[PDB]
Amino acid sequence: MRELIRLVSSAGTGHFYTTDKNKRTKPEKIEIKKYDPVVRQHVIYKEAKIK
RNA sequence: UCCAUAGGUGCAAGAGGCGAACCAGGGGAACUGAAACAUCUAAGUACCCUGAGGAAAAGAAAUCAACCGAGAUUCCCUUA
RNA sequence: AAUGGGUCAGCGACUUAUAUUCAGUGGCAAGCUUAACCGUAUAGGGUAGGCGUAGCGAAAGCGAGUCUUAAUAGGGCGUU
RNA sequence: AACCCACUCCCGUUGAAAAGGUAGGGGAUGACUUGUGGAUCGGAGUGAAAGGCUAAUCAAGCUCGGAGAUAGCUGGUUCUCCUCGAAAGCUAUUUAGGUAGCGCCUCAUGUAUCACUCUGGGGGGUAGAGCACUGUUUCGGCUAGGGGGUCAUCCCGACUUACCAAACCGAUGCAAACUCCGAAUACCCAGAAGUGCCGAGCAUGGGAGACACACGGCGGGUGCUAACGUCCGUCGUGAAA
RNA sequence: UUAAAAACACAGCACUCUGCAAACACGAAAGUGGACGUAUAGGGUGUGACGCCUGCCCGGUGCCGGAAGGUUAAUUGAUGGGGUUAGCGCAAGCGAAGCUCUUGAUCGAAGCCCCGGUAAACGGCGGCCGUAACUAUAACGGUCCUAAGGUAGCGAAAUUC
RNA sequence: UCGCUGUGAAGAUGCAGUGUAUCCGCGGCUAGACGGAAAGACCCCGUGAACCUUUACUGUAGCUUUGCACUGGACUUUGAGCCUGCUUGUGUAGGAUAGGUGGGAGGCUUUGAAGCGUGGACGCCAGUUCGCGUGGAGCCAUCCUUGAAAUACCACCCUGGCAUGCUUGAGGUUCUAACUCUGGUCCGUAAUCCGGAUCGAGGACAGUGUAUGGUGGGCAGUUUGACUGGGGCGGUCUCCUCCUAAAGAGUAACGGAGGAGUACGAAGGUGCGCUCAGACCGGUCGGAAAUCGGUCGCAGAGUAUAAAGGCAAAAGCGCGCUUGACUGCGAGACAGACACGUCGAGCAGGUACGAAAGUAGGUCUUAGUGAUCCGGUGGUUCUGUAUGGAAGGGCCAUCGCUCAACGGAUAAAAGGUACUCCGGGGAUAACAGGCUGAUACCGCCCAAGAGUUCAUAUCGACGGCGGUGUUUGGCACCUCGAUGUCGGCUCAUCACAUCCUGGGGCUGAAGCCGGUCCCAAGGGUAUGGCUGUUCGCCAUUUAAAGUGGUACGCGAGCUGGG
RNA sequence: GCUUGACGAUCAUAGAGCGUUGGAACCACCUGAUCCCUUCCCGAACUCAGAAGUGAAACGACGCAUCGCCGAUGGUAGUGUGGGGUCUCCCCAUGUGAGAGUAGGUCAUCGUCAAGC
Ligand SMILES: [Mg+2]
Ligand SMILES: [Mg+2]
Ligand SMILES: [Mg+2]
Ligand SMILES: [Mg+2]
Ligand SMILES: [Mg+2]
Ligand SMILES: [Mg+2]
Ligand SMILES: [Mg+2]
Ligand SMILES: [Mg+2]
Ligand SMILES: [Mg+2]
Ligand SMILES: [Mg+2]
Ligand SMILES: [Mg+2]
Ligand SMILES: [Mg+2]
Ligand SMILES: [Mg+2]
Ligand SMILES: [Mg+2]
Ligand SMILES: [Mg+2]
Ligand SMILES: [Mg+2]
Ligand SMILES: [Mg+2]
Ligand SMILES: [Mg+2]
Ligand SMILES: [Mg+2]
Ligand SMILES: [Mg+2]
Ligand SMILES: [Mg+2]
Ligand SMILES: [Mg+2]
Ligand SMILES: [Mg+2]
Ligand SMILES: [Mg+2]
Ligand SMILES: [Mg+2]
Ligand SMILES: [Mg+2]
Ligand SMILES: [Mg+2]
Ligand SMILES: [Mg+2]
Ligand SMILES: [Mg+2]
Ligand SMILES: [Mg+2]
Ligand SMILES: [Mg+2]
Ligand SMILES: [Mg+2]
Ligand SMILES: [Mg+2]
Ligand SMILES: [Mg+2]
Ligand SMILES: [Mg+2]
Ligand SMILES: [Mg+2]
Ligand SMILES: [Mg+2]
Ligand SMILES: [Mg+2]
Ligand SMILES: [Mg+2]
Ligand SMILES: [Mg+2]
Ligand SMILES: [Mg+2]
Ligand SMILES: [Mg+2]
Ligand SMILES: [Mg+2]
Ligand SMILES: [Mg+2]
Ligand SMILES: [Mg+2]
Ligand SMILES: [Mg+2]
Ligand SMILES: [Mg+2]
Ligand SMILES: [Mg+2]
Ligand SMILES: [Mg+2]
Ligand SMILES: [Mg+2]
Ligand SMILES: [Mg+2]
Ligand SMILES: [Mg+2]
Ligand SMILES: [Mg+2]
Ligand SMILES: [Mg+2]
Ligand SMILES: [Mg+2]
Ligand SMILES: [Mg+2]
Ligand SMILES: [Mg+2]
Ligand SMILES: [Mg+2]
Ligand SMILES: [Mg+2]
Ligand SMILES: [Mg+2]
Ligand SMILES: [Mg+2]
Ligand SMILES: [Mg+2]
Ligand SMILES: [Mg+2]
Ligand SMILES: [Mg+2]
Ligand SMILES: [Mg+2]
Ligand SMILES: [Mg+2]
Ligand SMILES: [Mg+2]
Ligand SMILES: [Mg+2]
Ligand SMILES: [Mg+2]
Ligand SMILES: [Mg+2]
Ligand SMILES: [Mg+2]
Ligand SMILES: [Mg+2]
Ligand SMILES: [Mg+2]
Ligand SMILES: [Mg+2]
Ligand SMILES: [Mg+2]
Ligand SMILES: [Mg+2]
Ligand SMILES: [Mg+2]
Ligand SMILES: [Mg+2]
Ligand SMILES: [Mg+2]
Ligand SMILES: [Mg+2]
Ligand SMILES: [Mg+2]
Ligand SMILES: [Mg+2]
Ligand SMILES: [Mg+2]
Ligand SMILES: [Mg+2]
Ligand SMILES: [Mg+2]
Ligand SMILES: [Mg+2]
Ligand SMILES: [Mg+2]
Ligand SMILES: [Mg+2]
Ligand SMILES: [Mg+2]
Ligand SMILES: [Mg+2]
Ligand SMILES: [Mg+2]
Ligand SMILES: [Mg+2]
Ligand SMILES: [Mg+2]
Ligand SMILES: [Mg+2]
Ligand SMILES: [Mg+2]
Ligand SMILES: [Mg+2]
Ligand SMILES: [Mg+2]
Ligand SMILES: [Mg+2]
Ligand SMILES: [Mg+2]
Ligand SMILES: [Mg+2]
Ligand SMILES: [Mg+2]
Ligand SMILES: [Mg+2]
Ligand SMILES: [Mg+2]
Ligand SMILES: [Mg+2]
Ligand SMILES: [Mg+2]
Ligand SMILES: [Mg+2]
Ligand SMILES: [Mg+2]
Ligand SMILES: [Mg+2]
Ligand SMILES: [Mg+2]
Ligand SMILES: [Mg+2]
Ligand SMILES: [Mg+2]
Ligand SMILES: [Mg+2]
Ligand SMILES: [Mg+2]
Ligand SMILES: [Mg+2]
Ligand SMILES: [Mg+2]
Ligand SMILES: [Mg+2]
Ligand SMILES: [Mg+2]
Ligand SMILES: [Mg+2]
Ligand SMILES: [Mg+2]
Ligand SMILES: [Mg+2]
Ligand SMILES: [Mg+2]
Ligand SMILES: [Mg+2]
Ligand SMILES: [Mg+2]
Ligand SMILES: [Mg+2]
Ligand SMILES: [Mg+2]
Ligand SMILES: [Mg+2]
Ligand SMILES: [Mg+2]
Ligand SMILES: [Mg+2]
Ligand SMILES: [Mg+2]
Ligand SMILES: [Mg+2]
Ligand SMILES: [Mg+2]
Ligand SMILES: [Mg+2]
Ligand SMILES: [Mg+2]
Ligand SMILES: [Mg+2]
Ligand SMILES: [Mg+2]
Ligand SMILES: [Mg+2]
Ligand SMILES: [Mg+2]
Ligand SMILES: [Mg+2]
Ligand SMILES: [Mg+2]
Ligand SMILES: [Mg+2]
Ligand SMILES: [Mg+2]
Ligand SMILES: [Mg+2]
Ligand SMILES: [Mg+2]
Ligand SMILES: [Mg+2]
Ligand SMILES: [Mg+2]
Ligand SMILES: [Mg+2]
Ligand SMILES: [Mg+2]
Ligand SMILES: [Mg+2]
Ligand SMILES: [Mg+2]
Ligand SMILES: [Mg+2]
Ligand SMILES: [Mg+2]
Ligand SMILES: [Mg+2]
Ligand SMILES: [Mg+2]
Ligand SMILES: [Mg+2]
Ligand SMILES: [Mg+2]
Ligand SMILES: [Mg+2]
Ligand SMILES: [Mg+2]
Ligand SMILES: [Mg+2]
Ligand SMILES: [Mg+2]
Ligand SMILES: [Mg+2]
Ligand SMILES: [Mg+2]
Ligand SMILES: [Mg+2]
Ligand SMILES: [Mg+2]
Ligand SMILES: [Mg+2]
Ligand SMILES: [Mg+2]
Ligand SMILES: [Mg+2]
Ligand SMILES: [Mg+2]
Ligand SMILES: [Mg+2]
Ligand SMILES: [Mg+2]
Ligand SMILES: [Mg+2]
Ligand SMILES: [Mg+2]
Ligand SMILES: [Mg+2]
Ligand SMILES: [Mg+2]
Ligand SMILES: [Mg+2]
Ligand SMILES: [Mg+2]
Ligand SMILES: [Mg+2]
Ligand SMILES: [Mg+2]
Ligand SMILES: [Mg+2]
Ligand SMILES: [Mg+2]
Ligand SMILES: [Mg+2]
Ligand SMILES: [Mg+2]
Ligand SMILES: [Mg+2]
Ligand SMILES: [Mg+2]
Ligand SMILES: [Mg+2]
Ligand SMILES: [Mg+2]
Ligand SMILES: [Mg+2]
Ligand SMILES: [Mg+2]
Ligand SMILES: [Mg+2]
Ligand SMILES: [Mg+2]
Ligand SMILES: [Mg+2]
Ligand SMILES: [Mg+2]
Ligand SMILES: [Mg+2]
Ligand SMILES: [Mg+2]
Ligand SMILES: [Mg+2]
Ligand SMILES: [Mg+2]
Ligand SMILES: [Mg+2]
Ligand SMILES: [Mg+2]
Ligand SMILES: [Mg+2]
Ligand SMILES: [Mg+2]
Ligand SMILES: [Mg+2]
Ligand SMILES: [Mg+2]
Ligand SMILES: [Mg+2]
Ligand SMILES: [Mg+2]
Ligand SMILES: [Mg+2]
Ligand SMILES: [Mg+2]
Ligand SMILES: [Mg+2]
Ligand SMILES: [Mg+2]
Ligand SMILES: [Mg+2]
Ligand SMILES: [Mg+2]
Ligand SMILES: [Mg+2]
């Protein structure tokens, strides 16, 4: 079943998004551009551990 | 058991028992509430026991405050 | 053909204390009111305290504003 | 026999008696019966064991205290007149005979809306109807084809379809979970006349009760279109006339 | 004080515990019974004169013995990570010694896991296929499972619908 | 203070209609007053109670393990630490030997006694250390070659292992002086208690305090859901779709049918482009069904996942680019007890596609879910108990429940009661009454057929229509502050759907006997064996051994076998 | 008013099917694939440069009711209110009133703009 993950900003802020994924099917990480509220720009977010 | 100790007799002085409550201690429930019930509550209450007094207890900061200060203990009204 | 009462006389069930809210009726009025306690004792004193005159925010705080927010934009609450 | 016991019948049952009597019955030198004095007791004693007995009380004695334990459960609640007037529903609940918010009653304050009819706008998929879809029914015609055989062809060509037959054409029925169609009524909305007991609507506060409903008509499920059956919707009456 | 019996006891039988300050029981304890007894004794448990007998299963749950290994308490405190501040630094920030907050290496018995016994310990003791000179039935063969598949006796029974 | 028949909270002295009847005792009998007595004991309910059980939960007495204390000496085995000489340092490599660093570049202390080696050895073994066997004797040649740095030389630490030292974990043995003795003899003393003394035995064990693991129904406080055509057993309990549902919304049943407790980094956004299923004809192995060509067809396909409502600007299909599955909000609504829920134009920041107008705050829509408390993680213009910090708290983001009994009592919980008890209920079962009549029983309609032929003498298949309250049931209206339930005895009373006796028609009625139907209720209508039996089966009778109602008549009339 | 193109209004009385007809202009077919651009292959489609040919295909216009689609009048079914019966179903008074079918209609009717008369 899908497991929760965190998406941490590449900037120095501590902002993060949250979602889930299928680890068995797609085993690589996710690199997706999102808006960072603290710096008010679109930056790249990287997968991390929910726990 | 040598010493002297336990022990044994004689004198004096005191205590012992009773009392409704109050006071300082020792021991210490459950029903009940939680709309069930174990933590919790009821409650350190009921009850039992021991001492004292006309009262008792506590009392003269190894205390509080907050950089300004207060000045032993007890009781009342607020802070609440 | 469900309950209660053989009858009479007497007795027998919404109380009291303390904290409060609303209404009626009064005293003062941007102020109102004292508690313990003194007392010439139902008087008078005692205004420590309580409520009101300003709100918003979790708070620091700022204030007819304030909070949220990058935002004197929008919106919540408040102000004649 | 005495003495200890208690198997049977009857009487008695407001008794002579809160366990007896008459007539029969068992043991009767023993694990016997009995007097006096003594010991063990309340989660404790004693018991050749029946949960028996512990002062006519025992699956935990009596007495006084905690104590007016607690009781969503029964019962009861005392003088008079006037105005108004319910509910037995929805939601949640270790909830279902309790309670809480909302709906329904009453009182106060404020404020401007309401009801009935006429006219004008609006959506619908019910009753009915139908077969255009999805299922289901019958008749006839027309047929691919399976094949009923077929001269029996070593086994392949066929003579024909004497059985069955998709599909198509026409006729003809049915449907809560079918629809090419489709009302009445009921619901929203607006504009108007009058009536309203002088108000109807709405908002905010004080006080509730109630959340076991019953039958009758109409529309339904369930049942046997059985029940003074039962479970909904909508009216009327009883409740409370 | 509605049940006198098939219920309880019983003599006999068996298992098990106990070496004496006994096991065991009543007692916060002192002590007392057991017992002024001593394994031919004392306690508990079941069965219930006598006769003939008392079959199979140690997988479960108890009890008994074993000690190699695994897991394992309080206790102890290696290691790592923080807080404070003499100092250094323009600053940001680094920071010795003390004190202090967490972390948790190592040490550690019984028990449990393991190995083996024990049923007059608590308990348990099966199915399906073929097969005989008529039929029928299977002495006989396969096969599944189990710790093992009920023996001797008795049986429409105080048990049988 | 009458009977009957109806009615009626459904079994009436009291109501309706009607019939009977002067007023009042005494002796008797018990059919009724749902007669008296005991707030039903059966049954259900109460977030009632007792007592009992156990591998329910949570604990506990007792028993047992180990640490510390009371609690000491010696010897020995042994792990760890520590001190000293540290002599040990044998690799590719070098005559020979590598852990390195500074003084140091040759050693001249009996030279550095010399070639092998003697006594002892170790040795990645043939190398090195220790008196040259004689004795006061020229060997290591200092990069002499090689080796990553040549020894000689003063110092800085350890390494394979030894000796001792002061400590230290465990093990065994012993000693006596702590402790213990429910062992002897002396004294207090006139004493099987108790002390003190002294002998004997055990002995740092036992035992007790405190801390800790195990065991522990021996004992204790409790828990063990609700709905429900009575309870129990079974089933269900949250969410989505359709019907019921009566053409706005909503609407119940243990009513009729199905699904959910997910999926997807593309299955999302955008630009561009394109249409299906199926049928027929033609065409290599396939042949009804592969891929190819053509015509028809238009949605009979598809849509991640049930069903319903939708789908041409396709919401279906493919390709390029991509992250709007964005952050702060939010006019206004829909739903609604609350807590929750649903839709959304527009504004501000930053984006993505597209030439651009523009589109994008996930997916065609409606299921895919769980409050608060508590604890964890990342930030932070907050707070931080004298002060500066810090701990802890607040705010923002996020994680942990099949709390499925799904608004979730607690972090933590099963049973028995026939030994039972209290408060209640005809709000709710068992007996009898009531309503109903599926079923039961009794009639009738049709007539295939059986009856040698012949439908109806006697029967009668497949089907149909009634009657009675009479069986098994359905319901739950009366009674739980009590209406005694099977069978037997005693005593009855009524109906007729007649068993005998009486009167008739038909007959497949010769007679004697019968069969069937019609009329008729006056009177009659067995005894026994077995069983608690009513029934039933047997034996022997009789003219015959009727069927039913009456609280399945009758316990204030008896019994007590069930 | 006449013909052809673009965009609309309206969504079958406007559609389908059959027959006839249109190249002056427009439109369509057409030639080639150098150049922009394109095919998961192909200039088939998209695109570019015009122009020799034709109205065949397509499209438009005009005819026909064969199919489709519209469709009365009258009657019938249902139904709100009030009242009756023999009451599982109906009837009466009053208001309302389908679906199906029958007679019959239909080969559409309009607006803006630009090219030729
Ligand atoms: Mg003396
Ligand atoms: Mg005194
Ligand atoms: Mg006194
Ligand atoms: Mg005290
Ligand atoms: Mg005291
Ligand atoms: Mg105390
Ligand atoms: Mg309690
Ligand atoms: Mg309670
Ligand atoms: Mg309570
Ligand atoms: Mg309770
Ligand atoms: Mg509790
Ligand atoms: Mg507990
Ligand atoms: Mg307490
Ligand atoms: Mg006290
Ligand atoms: Mg005194
Ligand atoms: Mg004094
Ligand atoms: Mg005194
Ligand atoms: Mg005095
Ligand atoms: Mg004084
Ligand atoms: Mg004093
Ligand atoms: Mg003093
Ligand atoms: Mg000072
Ligand atoms: Mg002083
Ligand atoms: Mg009466
Ligand atoms: Mg009664
Ligand atoms: Mg009465
Ligand atoms: Mg009652
Ligand atoms: Mg009475
Ligand atoms: Mg009085
Ligand atoms: Mg007032
Ligand atoms: Mg005033
Ligand atoms: Mg504002
Ligand atoms: Mg405002
Ligand atoms: Mg006796
Ligand atoms: Mg006699
Ligand atoms: Mg006698
Ligand atoms: Mg005797
Ligand atoms: Mg004798
Ligand atoms: Mg004797
Ligand atoms: Mg005897
Ligand atoms: Mg005697
Ligand atoms: Mg005595
Ligand atoms: Mg006594
Ligand atoms: Mg007791
Ligand atoms: Mg006892
Ligand atoms: Mg007993
Ligand atoms: Mg007893
Ligand atoms: Mg018993
Ligand atoms: Mg007494
Ligand atoms: Mg007694
Ligand atoms: Mg008790
Ligand atoms: Mg109390
Ligand atoms: Mg009381
Ligand atoms: Mg009660
Ligand atoms: Mg209740
Ligand atoms: Mg009552
Ligand atoms: Mg009462
Ligand atoms: Mg009125
Ligand atoms: Mg209720
Ligand atoms: Mg009630
Ligand atoms: Mg309520
Ligand atoms: Mg219909
Ligand atoms: Mg029809
Ligand atoms: Mg059809
Ligand atoms: Mg329909
Ligand atoms: Mg309607
Ligand atoms: Mg008036
Ligand atoms: Mg009100
Ligand atoms: Mg209700
Ligand atoms: Mg009521
Ligand atoms: Mg109702
Ligand atoms: Mg009801
Ligand atoms: Mg009703
Ligand atoms: Mg009805
Ligand atoms: Mg009904
Ligand atoms: Mg009915
Ligand atoms: Mg009813
Ligand atoms: Mg009704
Ligand atoms: Mg009414
Ligand atoms: Mg009336
Ligand atoms: Mg009336
Ligand atoms: Mg009422
Ligand atoms: Mg009336
Ligand atoms: Mg009324
Ligand atoms: Mg007896
Ligand atoms: Mg006897
Ligand atoms: Mg007896
Ligand atoms: Mg007995
Ligand atoms: Mg003993
Ligand atoms: Mg023995
Ligand atoms: Mg014994
Ligand atoms: Mg026995
Ligand atoms: Mg026996
Ligand atoms: Mg016996
Ligand atoms: Mg026996
Ligand atoms: Mg075993
Ligand atoms: Mg074994
Ligand atoms: Mg062992
Ligand atoms: Mg610091
Ligand atoms: Mg620092
Ligand atoms: Mg430090
Ligand atoms: Mg260890
Ligand atoms: Mg061990
Ligand atoms: Mg054995
Ligand atoms: Mg046995
Ligand atoms: Mg045998
Ligand atoms: Mg037998
Ligand atoms: Mg048996
Ligand atoms: Mg009568
Ligand atoms: Mg009557
Ligand atoms: Mg009468
Ligand atoms: Mg009367
Ligand atoms: Mg009358
Ligand atoms: Mg009357
Ligand atoms: Mg008389
Ligand atoms: Mg009599
Ligand atoms: Mg009588
Ligand atoms: Mg009676
Ligand atoms: Mg009675
Ligand atoms: Mg009572
Ligand atoms: Mg009762
Ligand atoms: Mg409960
Ligand atoms: Mg309850
Ligand atoms: Mg118990
Ligand atoms: Mg337990
Ligand atoms: Mg313990
Ligand atoms: Mg210890
Ligand atoms: Mg002893
Ligand atoms: Mg020891
Ligand atoms: Mg020990
Ligand atoms: Mg201990
Ligand atoms: Mg127990
Ligand atoms: Mg117990
Ligand atoms: Mg217990
Ligand atoms: Mg309790
Ligand atoms: Mg309980
Ligand atoms: Mg519970
Ligand atoms: Mg229940
Ligand atoms: Mg049931
Ligand atoms: Mg019901
Ligand atoms: Mg029922
Ligand atoms: Mg029901
Ligand atoms: Mg019922
Ligand atoms: Mg509706
Ligand atoms: Mg409706
Ligand atoms: Mg609805
Ligand atoms: Mg309802
Ligand atoms: Mg999609
Ligand atoms: Mg669909
Ligand atoms: Mg794409
Ligand atoms: Mg995205
Ligand atoms: Mg938007
Ligand atoms: Mg934007
Ligand atoms: Mg762009
Ligand atoms: Mg909690
Ligand atoms: Mg501080
Ligand atoms: Mg912090
Ligand atoms: Mg629940
Ligand atoms: Mg719930
Ligand atoms: Mg719910
Ligand atoms: Mg809900
Ligand atoms: Mg609770
Ligand atoms: Mg219980
Ligand atoms: Mg009772
Ligand atoms: Mg009661
Ligand atoms: Mg009832
Ligand atoms: Mg009920
Ligand atoms: Mg019955
Ligand atoms: Mg009866
Ligand atoms: Mg009955
Ligand atoms: Mg009945
Ligand atoms: Mg009944
Ligand atoms: Mg015949
Ligand atoms: Mg005949
Ligand atoms: Mg009857
Ligand atoms: Mg009946
Ligand atoms: Mg009933
Ligand atoms: Mg009921
Ligand atoms: Mg009912
Ligand atoms: Mg009755
Ligand atoms: Mg009853
Ligand atoms: Mg009564
Ligand atoms: Mg009669
Ligand atoms: Mg007759
Ligand atoms: Mg007869
Ligand atoms: Mg005859
Ligand atoms: Mg007959
Ligand atoms: Mg007769
Ligand atoms: Mg007769
Ligand atoms: Mg007669
Ligand atoms: Mg007669
Ligand atoms: Mg006569
Ligand atoms: Mg007889
Ligand atoms: Mg018999
Ligand atoms: Mg005869
Ligand atoms: Mg009779
Ligand atoms: Mg009877
Ligand atoms: Mg009878
Ligand atoms: Mg009797
Ligand atoms: Mg009887
Ligand atoms: Mg009697
Ligand atoms: Mg009677
Ligand atoms: Mg009677
Ligand atoms: Mg009698
Ligand atoms: Mg009996
Ligand atoms: Mg018409
Ligand atoms: Mg009507
Ligand atoms: Mg009409
Ligand atoms: Mg028409
Ligand atoms: Mg039509």
mmCIF file of all heavy atoms in Angstrom, chain F residues 485-488:
data_model
loop_
_atom_site.group_PDB
_atom_site.id
_atom_site.type_symbol
_atom_site.label_atom_id
_atom_site.label_comp_id
_atom_site.label_asym_id
_atom_site.label_seq_id
_atom_site.Cartn_x
_atom_site.Cartn_y
_atom_site.Cartn_z
ATOM 1 P P U F 485 -55.847 -23.077 36.628
ATOM 2 O OP1 U F 485 -56.837 -22.190 35.985
ATOM 3 O OP2 U F 485 -56.311 -24.048 37.638
ATOM 4 O "O5'" U F 485 -55.074 -23.885 35.501
ATOM 5 C "C5'" U F 485 -54.313 -25.039 35.831
ATOM 6 C "C4'" U F 485 -53.813 -25.755 34.604
ATOM 7 O "O4'" U F 485 -52.913 -24.875 33.880
ATOM 8 C "C3'" U F 485 -53.015 -27.026 34.883
ATOM 9 O "O3'" U F 485 -53.150 -27.920 33.777
ATOM 10 C "C2'" U F 485 -51.587 -26.503 34.907
ATOM 11 O "O2'" U F 485 -50.606 -27.489 34.682
ATOM 12 C "C1'" U F 485 -51.642 -25.483 33.776
ATOM 13 N N1 U F 485 -50.623 -24.428 33.831
ATOM 14 C C2 U F 485 -49.615 -24.462 32.890
ATOM 15 O O2 U F 485 -49.522 -25.330 32.044
ATOM 16 N N3 U F 485 -48.704 -23.446 32.981
ATOM 17 C C4 U F 485 -48.708 -22.414 33.892
ATOM 18 O O4 U F 485 -47.819 -21.569 33.842
ATOM 19 C C5 U F 485 -49.788 -22.441 34.824
ATOM 20 C C6 U F 485 -50.692 -23.420 34.760
ATOM 21 P P C F 486 -54.559 -28.595 33.414
ATOM 22 O OP1 C F 486 -55.213 -27.785 32.367
ATOM 23 O OP2 C F 486 -55.276 -28.887 34.670
ATOM 24 O "O5'" C F 486 -54.157 -29.979 32.746
ATOM 25 C "C5'" C F 486 -53.366 -30.020 31.568
ATOM 26 C "C4'" C F 486 -52.704 -31.364 31.388
ATOM 27 O "O4'" C F 486 -51.615 -31.516 32.333
ATOM 28 C "C3'" C F 486 -53.576 -32.580 31.638
ATOM 29 O "O3'" C F 486 -54.411 -32.897 30.543
ATOM 30 C "C2'" C F 486 -52.553 -33.656 31.951
ATOM 31 O "O2'" C F 486 -51.940 -34.116 30.760
ATOM 32 C "C1'" C F 486 -51.517 -32.863 32.741
ATOM 33 N N1 C F 486 -51.752 -32.929 34.199
ATOM 34 C C2 C F 486 -51.443 -34.092 34.906
ATOM 35 O O2 C F 486 -50.987 -35.061 34.297
ATOM 36 N N3 C F 486 -51.663 -34.128 36.234
ATOM 37 C C4 C F 486 -52.160 -33.068 36.858
ATOM 38 N N4 C F 486 -52.355 -33.144 38.171
ATOM 39 C C5 C F 486 -52.473 -31.874 36.168
ATOM 40 C C6 C F 486 -52.254 -31.848 34.857
ATOM 41 P P G F 487 -55.889 -33.459 30.792
ATOM 42 O OP1 G F 487 -56.448 -33.830 29.478
ATOM 43 O OP2 G F 487 -56.612 -32.504 31.653
ATOM 44 O "O5'" G F 487 -55.667 -34.801 31.616
ATOM 45 C "C5'" G F 487 -55.376 -36.020 30.957
ATOM 46 C "C4'" G F 487 -54.997 -37.110 31.926
ATOM 47 O "O4'" G F 487 -53.978 -36.639 32.846
ATOM 48 C "C3'" G F 487 -56.085 -37.620 32.847
ATOM 49 O "O3'" G F 487 -57.012 -38.482 32.216
ATOM 50 C "C2'" G F 487 -55.270 -38.291 33.938
ATOM 51 O "O2'" G F 487 -54.742 -39.524 33.483
ATOM 52 C "C1'" G F 487 -54.120 -37.299 34.088
ATOM 53 N N9 G F 487 -54.446 -36.310 35.126
ATOM 54 C C8 G F 487 -54.771 -34.996 34.967
ATOM 55 N N7 G F 487 -55.049 -34.407 36.089
ATOM 56 C C5 G F 487 -54.919 -35.396 37.044
ATOM 57 C C6 G F 487 -55.093 -35.357 38.446
ATOM 58 O O6 G F 487 -55.412 -34.406 39.153
ATOM 59 N N1 G F 487 -54.863 -36.585 39.032
ATOM 60 C C2 G F 487 -54.504 -37.711 38.354
ATOM 61 N N2 G F 487 -54.323 -38.804 39.090
ATOM 62 N N3 G F 487 -54.331 -37.767 37.053
ATOM 63 C C4 G F 487 -54.554 -36.579 36.461
ATOM 64 P P G F 488 -58.564 -38.437 32.625
ATOM 65 O OP1 G F 488 -59.343 -39.239 31.663
ATOM 66 O OP2 G F 488 -58.934 -37.024 32.829
ATOM 67 O "O5'" G F 488 -58.623 -39.176 34.032
ATOM 68 C "C5'" G F 488 -58.226 -40.532 34.169
ATOM 69 C "C4'" G F 488 -58.126 -40.937 35.618
ATOM 70 O "O4'" G F 488 -57.194 -40.067 36.309
ATOM 71 C "C3'" G F 488 -59.397 -40.825 36.437
ATOM 72 O "O3'" G F 488 -60.285 -41.909 36.248
ATOM 73 C "C2'" G F 488 -58.861 -40.716 37.855
ATOM 74 O "O2'" G F 488 -58.434 -41.981 38.328
ATOM 75 C "C1'" G F 488 -57.624 -39.856 37.636
ATOM 76 N N9 G F 488 -57.921 -38.425 37.811
ATOM 77 C C8 G F 488 -57.884 -37.465 36.845
ATOM 78 N N7 G F 488 -58.197 -36.289 37.286
ATOM 79 C C5 G F 488 -58.458 -36.483 38.629
ATOM 80 C C6 G F 488 -58.846 -35.565 39.628
ATOM 81 O O6 G F 488 -59.043 -34.359 39.514
ATOM 82 N N1 G F 488 -59.002 -36.172 40.861
ATOM 83 C C2 G F 488 -58.818 -37.500 41.099
ATOM 84 N N2 G F 488 -59.017 -37.923 42.347
ATOM 85 N N3 G F 488 -58.452 -38.364 40.179
ATOM 86 C C4 G F 488 -58.289 -37.795 38.972
#
